[PDB]
Amino acid sequence: SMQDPIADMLTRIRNGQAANKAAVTMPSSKLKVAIANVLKEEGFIEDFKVEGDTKPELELTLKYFQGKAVVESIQRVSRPGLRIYKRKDELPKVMAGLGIAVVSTSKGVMTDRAARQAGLGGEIICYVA
Amino acid sequence: SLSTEATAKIVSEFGRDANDTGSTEVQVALLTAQINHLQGHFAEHKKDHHSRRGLLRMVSQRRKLLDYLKRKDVARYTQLIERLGLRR
Amino acid sequence: KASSXA
RNA sequence: UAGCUAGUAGGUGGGGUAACGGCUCACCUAGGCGACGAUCCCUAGCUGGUCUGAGAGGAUGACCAGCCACACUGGAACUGA
RNA sequence: GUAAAGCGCACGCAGGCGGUUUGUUAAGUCAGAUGUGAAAUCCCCGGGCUCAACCUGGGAACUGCAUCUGAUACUGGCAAGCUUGAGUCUCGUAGAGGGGGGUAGAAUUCCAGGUGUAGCGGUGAAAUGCGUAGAGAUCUGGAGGAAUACCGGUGGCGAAGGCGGCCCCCUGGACGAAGACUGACGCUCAGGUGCGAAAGCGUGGGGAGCAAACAGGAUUAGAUACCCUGGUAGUCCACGCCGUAAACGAUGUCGACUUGGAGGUUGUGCCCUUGAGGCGUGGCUUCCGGAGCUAACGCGUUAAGUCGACCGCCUGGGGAGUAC
RNA sequence: CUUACCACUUUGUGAUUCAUGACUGGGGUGAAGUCGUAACAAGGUAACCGUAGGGGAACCUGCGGUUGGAUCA
Ligand SMILES: [Mg+2]
Ligand SMILES: [Mg+2]
Ligand SMILES: [Mg+2]
Ligand SMILES: [Mg+2]
Ligand SMILES: [Mg+2]
Ligand SMILES: [Mg+2]
Ligand SMILES: [Mg+2]
Ligand SMILES: [Mg+2]
Ligand SMILES: [Mg+2]
Ligand SMILES: [Mg+2]
Ligand SMILES: [Mg+2]
Ligand SMILES: [Mg+2]
Ligand SMILES: [Mg+2]
Ligand SMILES: [Mg+2]
Ligand SMILES: [Mg+2]
């Protein structure tokens, strides 16, 4: 059954990005937005949009550059089937730096750079580049 | 299968109104009905396994509702089992 | 198994 | 190897030891353990560490040091801090 | 998928995992602080033996455990919900889905009766066999078992195995359409339970056709076979046992997502239903093919693409799915 | 002197494990052995799977399944 949206979001992005799709919809959530935010804020998509009342609908605008898309690779790290909690020294560095790692902290859902500067740790959600 | 009255009747017996057709209690009953009826159906036959496959689903499904109820409304469950005279 | 022996 | 368990599990009260304790004894409750592997078999002294490995791992417990056990074999107390 | 590897298939307990909103919690998670983590070792920088090995000063390290105090996004717990997941109801829709019970229509075989006259049958050729005590050919009615031509599909239903004449009785599931209702009740499943071709096993029936075994005739160097003439168990029914098949898509289940094109099938909605029909919208199902995947052949919105959850299984050939 | 505990040790009957055993079962390995030629081509009767019966031997036959069957049948 449908036991992991967070993942599902990521892959809807990846599957869309692949097919040169201009937009991407999905039944929404707070955390999807929390994520979707880091994507604009860190420069991977142009912006989100929530046409919703009882059954929200988060909508993303895919970025592209040349004939190739902006989300080079997007990977679900932690899963319900296997949870991943890092500290701060153990925070990952995607692409030797040139890439972000969405991590959920007790002061909010930020990037590895952010979590680093803020000097805190938490469940790493996913790698992106 | 299940008589339109017999269905309607029971919906208007265990259900908190007619039209409250999706109620847990109702289903449990609507099921217990069928299960009990078919009971005579496979009283002879015994070989209508395909149907029995259907029976078992009803029985299964019921056990999963009775269980839901026990988790939610301890009172309604306990009252319900004595009400259908089953579960033991 | 087995001509000239062998 | 899927069951194990009578001082067995707990309580009370005596006794007991440097000391807590079924450590022991009488009585009373009927418990206690187990698929998060009891029970039963097989092998083994443990660690610091050593060797290998990019690491994660695998392999290992000589020499040094810490800890435990044993002193022909089985058993037992005495002396005494 | 074909290299070793998806359990034949479903139901389901324990376990794992879990949509969406708020509050709270603070177990997991995160942050900081204090004890601690023997020395030697390793590592860094030095120092001492002519150098090195060796010896040595100080540090770093010991990725750990514990505690107190904090942080509250995610996870978990508790409280109250929400309706898209899931589920009940309403009307229908299609269907070899199942069990039980009648009957119809060809055909084979057998019996009875008629004429008839010497052939039928079979093969590569022959023969055994059936007719000279009269078959086959052939004439009529009747008995019995088994299976349902044509429709018939590239179809349909079922979890799988599987299920085709017609008719009646009880019964499963699916799907479309409008809504109504419960409100995360869900996904998966070690063990467990059940179903599970054909052959086989027990008791009793039934037995036309076909046919292991067996017999006879041929073939061949041989022929324990292929072929021919016969034919018993069996195939059919009742009940019980058996649990295996190349039980195959050699492809586990569930959910989401990713260009197209030609059909089949069963629905529903709209068009003076105008009449061959058209244009939407579902479920299911053949064919070709993009990307992507792939060792390749090929798979390709019914994935073998892109992701997640849970289970099953594989680890060189043989020995062996054997021995204990 | 006596009582309780208790070691060596005694008896009966099981479990288990190691070695060994006339004889026997298949297995593996050995340039050219004997018998036949089952499979690979439509392998000269398409093959294979489960099962059953038979046969010096591979195998042969019945029932159902599979295409991992060649062919304008
Ligand atoms: Mg006391
Ligand atoms: Mg005392
Ligand atoms: Mg390794
Ligand atoms: Mg001694
Ligand atoms: Mg294979
Ligand atoms: Mg399968
Ligand atoms: Mg909470
Ligand atoms: Mg140290
Ligand atoms: Mg029989
Ligand atoms: Mg098998
Ligand atoms: Mg094709
Ligand atoms: Mg065996
Ligand atoms: Mg041959
Ligand atoms: Mg052949
Ligand atoms: Mg056959």
Side-chain angles (χ1 to χ4, degrees):
Chain A
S1 176
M2 174 49 184
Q3 302 181 27
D4 183 16
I6 316 307
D8 181 88
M9 182 218 315
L10 297 170
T11 177
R12 284 206 173 152
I13 299 174
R14 166 156 17 73
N15 287 5
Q17 286 278 109
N20 284 23
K21 298 300 286 161
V24 158
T25 59
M26 80 195 69
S28 181
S29 89
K30 311 316 291 179
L31 197 54
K32 290 196 189 66
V33 176
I35 286 172
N37 199 308
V38 190
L39 297 175
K40 178 176 184 173
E41 189 170 358
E42 287 292 351
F44 286 108
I45 57 174
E46 200 156 335
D47 71 324
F48 60 79
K49 191 169 180 55
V50 50
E51 273 74 37
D53 55 330
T54 136
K55 300 174 183 57
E57 177 182 83
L58 189 160
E59 177 181 294
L60 296 183
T61 61
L62 292 310
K63 286 169 60 185
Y64 300 75
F65 196 67
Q66 262 57 315
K68 269 191 155 54
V70 164
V71 188
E72 185 105 14
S73 81
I74 184 163
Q75 298 299 2
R76 183 83 159 102
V77 172
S78 189
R79 317 171 304 157
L82 211 296
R83 298 288 166 176
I84 316 295
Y85 310 111
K86 304 294 183 60
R87 284 189 293 276
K88 56 164 291 191
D89 318 313
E90 216 164 353
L91 285 169
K93 184 163 278 187
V94 170
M95 282 196 63
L98 11 166
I100 64 173
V102 181
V103 18
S104 172
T105 311
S106 68
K107 288 188 166 67
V109 188
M110 69 196 87
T111 196
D112 63 292
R113 220 168 198 160
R116 186 181 301 275
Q117 168 193 353
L120 25 72
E123 172 170 332
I124 61 183
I125 293 83
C126 59
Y127 290 147
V128 200
Chain B
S1 302
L2 190 61
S3 193
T4 333
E5 53 180 336
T7 54
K9 288 164 86 277
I10 293 175
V11 175
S12 303
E13 291 160 22
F14 303 83
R16 285 176 165 75
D17 55 90
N19 302 332
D20 185 17
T21 180
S23 158
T24 296
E25 292 81 356
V26 171
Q27 299 190 29
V28 176
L30 288 175
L31 289 169
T32 311
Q34 260 292 78
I35 295 167
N36 300 11
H37 163 52
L38 279 308
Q39 212 56 209
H41 173 57
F42 310 109
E44 71 175 62
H45 299 329
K46 312 168 169 191
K47 310 286 191 59
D48 186 350
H49 297 107
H50 290 60
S51 297
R52 179 108 59 194
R53 184 175 135 92
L55 178 59
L56 302 164
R57 177 168 181 171
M58 298 162 183
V59 182
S60 314
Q61 191 62 36
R62 173 172 66 172
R63 223 300 197 191
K64 286 181 175 178
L65 301 188
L66 287 158
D67 281 346
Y68 164 73
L69 216 175
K70 182 176 77 179
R71 195 176 64 79
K72 287 296 187 179
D73 194 313
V74 188
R76 286 201 287 166
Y77 166 74
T78 5
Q79 194 180 42
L80 179 59
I81 77 173
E82 278 106 53
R83 195 168 168 196
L84 278 306
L86 71 205
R87 177 53 178 148
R88 308 181 274 265
Chain C
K1 121 184 294 151
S3 194
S4 26

